Amino acid sequence: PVVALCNTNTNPELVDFIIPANNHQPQSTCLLMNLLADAVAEAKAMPTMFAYKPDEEIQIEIPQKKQITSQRLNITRNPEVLTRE
Amino acid sequence: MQIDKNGIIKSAQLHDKDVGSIQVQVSLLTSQIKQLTDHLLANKKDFISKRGLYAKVSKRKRLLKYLKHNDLEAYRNLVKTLNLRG
Amino acid sequence: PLFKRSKKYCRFCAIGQLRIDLIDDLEALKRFLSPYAKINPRRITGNCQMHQRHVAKALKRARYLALVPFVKD
Amino acid sequence: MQYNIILLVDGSLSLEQANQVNEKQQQTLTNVEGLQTEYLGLKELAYPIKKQLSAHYYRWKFSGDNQSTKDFKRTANINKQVLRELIINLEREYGYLASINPKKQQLALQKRAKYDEIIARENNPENPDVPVTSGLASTQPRLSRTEKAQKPKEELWDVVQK
Amino acid sequence: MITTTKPIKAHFDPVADLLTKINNARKAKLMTVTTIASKLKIAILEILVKEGYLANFQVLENKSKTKRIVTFNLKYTQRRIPSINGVKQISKPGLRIYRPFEKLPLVLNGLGIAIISTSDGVMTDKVARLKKIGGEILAYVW
Amino acid sequence: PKIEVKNDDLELALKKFKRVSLEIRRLAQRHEYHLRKGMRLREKRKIAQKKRRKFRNMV
RNA sequence: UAUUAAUCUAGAGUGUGGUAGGGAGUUUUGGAAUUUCAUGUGGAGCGGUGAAAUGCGUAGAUAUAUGAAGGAACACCAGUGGCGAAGGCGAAAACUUAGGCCAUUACUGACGCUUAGGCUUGAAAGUGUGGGGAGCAAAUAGGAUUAGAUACCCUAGUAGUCCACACCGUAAACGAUAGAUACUAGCUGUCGGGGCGAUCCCCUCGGUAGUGAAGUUAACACAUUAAGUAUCUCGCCUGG
Numbered sequence A: 001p002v003v004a005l006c007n008t009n010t011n012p013e014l015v016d017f018i019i020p021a022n023n024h025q026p027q028s029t030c031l032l033m034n035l036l037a038d039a040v041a042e043a044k045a046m047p048t049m050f051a052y053k054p055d056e057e058i059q060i061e062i063p064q065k066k067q068i069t070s071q072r073l074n075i076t077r078n079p080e081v082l083t084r085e
Numbered sequence B: 001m002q003i004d005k006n007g008i009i010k011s012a013q014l015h016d017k018d019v020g021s022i023q024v025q026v027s028l029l030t031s032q033i034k035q036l037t038d039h040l041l042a043n044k045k046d047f048i049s050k051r052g053l054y055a056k057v058s059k060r061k062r063l064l065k066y067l068k069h070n071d072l073e074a075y076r077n078l079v080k081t082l083n084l085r086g
Numbered sequence C: 001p002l003f004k005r006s007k008k009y010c011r012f013c014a015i016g017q018l019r020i021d022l023i024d025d026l027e028a029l030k031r032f033l034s035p036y037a038k039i040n041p042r043r044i045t046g047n048c049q050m051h052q053r054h055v056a057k058a059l060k061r062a063r064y065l066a067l068v069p070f071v072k073d
Numbered sequence D: 001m002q003y004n005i006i007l008l009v010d011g012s013l014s015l016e017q018a019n020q021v022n023e024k025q026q027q028t029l030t031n032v033e034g035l036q037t038e039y040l041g042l043k044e045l046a047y048p049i050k051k052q053l054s055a056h057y058y059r060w061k062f063s064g065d066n067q068s069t070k071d072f073k074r075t076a077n078i079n080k081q082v083l084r085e086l087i088i089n090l091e092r093e094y095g096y097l098a099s100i101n102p103k104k105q106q107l108a109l110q111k112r113a114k115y116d117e118i119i120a121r122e123n124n125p126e127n128p129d130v131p132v133t134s135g136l137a138s139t140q141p142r143l144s145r146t147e148k149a150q151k152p153k154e155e156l157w158d159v160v161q162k
Numbered sequence E: 001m002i003t004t005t006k007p008i009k010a011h012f013d014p015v016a017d018l019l020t021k022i023n024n025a026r027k028a029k030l031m032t033v034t035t036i037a038s039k040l041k042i043a044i045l046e047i048l049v050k051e052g053y054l055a056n057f058q059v060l061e062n063k064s065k066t067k068r069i070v071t072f073n074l075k076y077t078q079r080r081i082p083s084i085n086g087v088k089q090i091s092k093p094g095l096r097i098y099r100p101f102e103k104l105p106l107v108l109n110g111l112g113i114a115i116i117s118t119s120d121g122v123m124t125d126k127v128a129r130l131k132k133i134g135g136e137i138l139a140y141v142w
Numbered sequence F: 001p002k003i004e005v006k007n008d009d010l011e012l013a014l015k016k017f018k019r020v021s022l023e024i025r026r027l028a029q030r031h032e033y034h035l036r037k038g039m040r041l042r043e044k045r046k047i048a049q050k051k052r053r054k055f056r057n058m059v
Numbered sequence G: 001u002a003u004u005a006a007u008c009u010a011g012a013g014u015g016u017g018g019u020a021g022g023g024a025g026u027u028u029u030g031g032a033a034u035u036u037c038a039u040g041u042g043g044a045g046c047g048g049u050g051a052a053a054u055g056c057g058u059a060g061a062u063a064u065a066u067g068a069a070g071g072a073a074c075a076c077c078a079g080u081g082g083c084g085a086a087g088g089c090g091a092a093a094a095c096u097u098a099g100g101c102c103a104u105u106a107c108u109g110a111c112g113c114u115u116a117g118g119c120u121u122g123a124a125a126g127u128g129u130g131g132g133g134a135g136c137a138a139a140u141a142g143g144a145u146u147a148g149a150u151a152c153c154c155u156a157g158u159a160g161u162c163c164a165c166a167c168c169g170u171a172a173a174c175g176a177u178a179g180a181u182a183c184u185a186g187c188u189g190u191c192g193g194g195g196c197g198a199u200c201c202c203c204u205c206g207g208u209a210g211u212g213a214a215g216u217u218a219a220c221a222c223a224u225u226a227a228g229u230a231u232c233u234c235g236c237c238u239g240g
Ligand SMILES: [Mg+2]
Pocket: none
């Protein structure tokens, strides 16, 4: 079994438990990964971090290094494969 | 010299709004041929017009064959008026 | 490398002239012409293909009516 | 049809070249409507064709049958006072149907005046700027498109058996 | 009242038209398809749904009663693999296939179905054997 | 191709005339041997393609 | 299924309304550039090559400036382009003319696909008659190179390349992929018609490209413009 966070551009056959989500945002990714870790943590019998929890304790911050977004650009870096004769 | 499509349709119409039958189509086709035979006879080196002329000639023959297969009596009426046989 | 703006715009399309006459925008066509009495290409002139052809025919027609030069020398 | 001649005559003197245009008008043009003429006049010439650089420019906006061209064309060369003449038949020019189309004119007018307001723009250039060299995206999509978007003609179908 | 958006056109051969539609839908995993409706196509599709390869088939008519198009769907299982495996047409235009009752074919040792329209419209091969009467053989479906 | 020297400096003059002459030179080698229409069309499309691909990665 | 007697519009056409084109023929016109000739200035080489030599030049060449004559082809535009069934089409104009795309509450009402035989067109070279001939150049002469050079190089150089009318009917005439019909992911371009109304960009209907999965192939590769899933018709293949 393999689970994955598909982002609209993945072949569904390869993954087993697809979990529609983002993958480019340092906030969505962290939230979902901890949730799966939280299931494991509850099964292992140590307190959870984000799952089955209220509003006041889930708030997280956006990492630094325009603005946190998720647009895919940088298309100019895809010219024609070097050819001609 | 040029033709007028409006006049030929009004003359060859069997009844009003019948602007797409076989009789009106073949009458228009014959008129353009007369003009087109003139043009090709004058020039003698334009072959696209010759291709168009041959294609147009073939369409009337096929159209007249169909109108012979169905309702042959109306074929007689149209042929004597238009004088296309000979 | 180099940098600049991709402003490359077809003038006549925004102004919607839709029609080119050689004695209505003569000073406009002289801009499209290069200083060497030569019709500038896409990279410089900036019009679309349709208006470039239209301006090109008009520029050559003016050059037949003997309104604009044909080459420096 | 409606033709448009752009005549060229020598730079002798204005009234006699204007007079020269009148004979060329009354002799030929077998069948013709009203021949309104303007007087671009003695403008400089791009080359000394016919050993002439100072020419009077005339434009004729007549209209008539296709026979109006032959006699005038064959007489122009013979006449030593005429340098060039071009009968630019506007029914074959690059774009003739749109100028007669009424709604097209309107949208054309439409397009020009707004782009021009952009041109006017409160303290617009900020530098030479060229006619544009400064054009923002058409904001969010032209909502008018989304509202007046045309629904095609398909068909409503009714169930019969199941 | 079912609405559509696309114009519906179809190929001329009504048995292989359906066969091409069915095979392409199977290969492309498509579910909803449309085609023009003919009584032969309706009847052959009716026995098809009785023999159990497709689920539903609804024919509709225009508001003028001049055109009819049949829109059928396939029976996919939960894991999204179809029940149809392969379709092949025998009596193509030009070469019409006529076999007597004694030479009625058996498809995949009886697992598949052979479609035969003898005299009382289209009829499956097994019931055709029961009636001891044969005729036109349209296509093999398994 | 007249361009004035302006008599303020010389270098600037040779910097512009070098460009004009190279575009002039290009056509000069083009017009020395007559090639067939197929071969001639091939070299035009090739030059455009070379310039195009260059402009693609330079833009 | 075939025959016959009829109805319908969705196939295909016609008309109206939008509309893009280097589509074709005929008749006129124009400028750069070369050659020759005319007139000046000028004074020893020019030309050609790997290096040179035939060759041109004190009879004043090359060069420079002006003019005249003539023929051929139409820089730029010109394209990650347009048109035509193909060959092909790019200086300008006039006249005649072919097809195509989009929307159709209009009309006829299966009138459609393919096509043996037949007809038409069909690059260049080649032929016959009459013109034309600036440049270029098969054949040919000379100078080089070479062991030899009937070749590659150079200097000359006829037919021909051009036009009109008659033939020839072949090409790697290639997308090495016949036409028509139905279905099958998507993405990035670009062109045309239409809708909105700043361009730009969005949507629809088409044409032309790139990338790309199922699918196909021996592989390369094709992949909605198929070499995929299927039907009709024609042409063709059966070891060297
Ligand atoms: Mg001179």
